Amino acid sequence: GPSDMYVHVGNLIYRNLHLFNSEMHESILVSYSSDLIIYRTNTVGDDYIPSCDCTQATYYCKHKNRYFPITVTSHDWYEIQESEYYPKHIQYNLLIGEGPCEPGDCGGKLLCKHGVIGIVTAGGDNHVAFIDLRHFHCA
Ligand SMILES: [Zn+2]
């Protein structure tokens, strides 16, 4: 659903590594540099990760409990200021754009007209960053 804070495609669940990492040894894929973890699940999800290059997007902002349109820009990597879960660091495979973000917002879905392309991973001042999931799926 629109409010689910993760992506569920077939039997794969995509989530923020910093909010998983507990059963990390049971996961199927981990990208430490991208705050991403993927694992097998027993139910089938209906999300779909496309392989487009869209920048016209929309995302779920948990603390506002609503969706916001957003224009995102790709970044192979980018500096990310310290937080409550990650200290100052460079993160990779990002999508950034302007919009609200507060602690607890990670996992929120970012979608383009084709499907889900990311999940919230970080928030700065007036900007929000997402993991570009298109980079972890075969076309
Ligand atoms: Zn698209």
68 and 4 in a common domain: no
- Domains in the chain: how many in total? 2
SS3 content of the chain, % helix, strand, coil (to 5): 10, 50, 35
Experimental technique behind these coordinates: X-ray
104 and 84 in a common domain: yes
50 and 80 in a common domain: yes
Q: Which protein residues have a CB closer than 5 Å to ligand 1 (ion)?
A: 50, 52, 54, 112, 114
Q: Determine the distance separating the centroid of ligand 1 and the alpha carbon of 87, expressed in angstroms.
A: 31
The answer to whether 112 and 135 are in contact (CB under 8 A) is no
Structural resolution in Å:
2.0
Catalytic residue numbers read 18, 35, 106
139 and 125 in a common domain: yes
CB crowding 58-76: b at 16 or more within 10 Å, else e: bbbbbeeeeebebebeeee
For residues 16 and 36, give the distance between their C-alpha atoms in angstroms, rounded to a whole number: 5
122 and 81 in a common domain: yes
Q: Determine the distance separating the centroid of ligand 1 and the alpha carbon of 107, expressed in angstroms.
A: 19
Annotated binding residue 25: no
Residue numbers of the domain that contains 67 = 45-139
12 and 76 in a common domain: no
> What is the strand order of the sheet 56-61 is part of?
66-71, 56-61, 109-111, 116-123, 127-132, 89-98, 73-80
Look up the CATH number of the domain holding residue 110: 2.40.10.10
